[PDB]
């Protein structure tokens, strides 16, 4: 089953997909998911993208202090001490981001919906 797999799930209002993990399967096509910040709730399957990790060359939004819409492209993955890091390219330069800092806007997530969506 999908229980225990890491994913990115849309978040109601802003429609952004945040890194999380499916903790239980429920009815009504919903899933109990736990976001990396500790918040747990039920979301619909159509709002979940089975991505661990976000694939290379995906356009994403990389979070940094006082930056909320900074777009970039995934160009690398790296495992270190049981933690995933993303190499994000922007304006010809690459920077390292931790997993939870990499999110997808509605448009960015829609591009993966067909292949990785649980709809």
Ligand X SMILES: CC(C)c1cccc(C(=O)NCCCNC(C)(C)C)c1
Q: Give me the residues that bind ligand X (CB under 6 A), please.
A: 11, 18-19, 35-37, 39, 100
Between 46 and 95, whose beta carbon lies closer to a second copy?
95
- Where does this chain bind a second copy (CB under 8 A)? 11-16, 18, 34, 36-41, 63-66, 68, 82-84, 98-101, 103
Minimal distance in Å, beta carbon 14 to a second copy? Answer: 6
Q: Which is nearer to a second copy, 6 or 111 (CB)?
A: 6
Structure tokens belonging to residue 102: 């990499």
Q: Which is nearer to a second copy, 37 or 114 (CB)?
A: 37
| Helices and strands in the chain: count of H runs, count of E runs | 1, 10
DSSP 46: G
CB of 91 to ligand X, least distance (A): 23
80 binds, among ligand X, a second copy, none (CB under 5 to 8 A by kind): none
| Two tokens, residue 91 | 């304006």
* Distance separating alpha carbons of residues 51 and 94, to the nearest angstrom: 21
Q: Nearest-5° angle of CA 13, CA 112, CA 55?
A: 115
Question: By C-alpha distance, which of 104, 95, 96, 20 is closest to 58?
Answer: 104
């Amino acid at each position: 089953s999908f229980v225990g797999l890491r994913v990115v799930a849309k978040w109601s209002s802003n429609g952004y997909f945040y890194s999380g993990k499916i903790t239980r399967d429920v009815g009504a096509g919903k899933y109990k998911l736990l976001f990396d910040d500790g918040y747990e709730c039920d979301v619909l399957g159509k709002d979940i993208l089975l991505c661990d990790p976000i694939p290379l060359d995906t356009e994403v939004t990389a979070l940094s202090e006082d930056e909320y819409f900074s777009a970039g492209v995934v160009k690398g993955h790296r495992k270190e001490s049981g933690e995933l890091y993303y190499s994000i390219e922007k304006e010809g330069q690459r920077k390292w981001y931790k997993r939870m800092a990499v999110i997808l806007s509605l448009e960015q997530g829609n591009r993966l919906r067909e292949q990785y969506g649980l709809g």
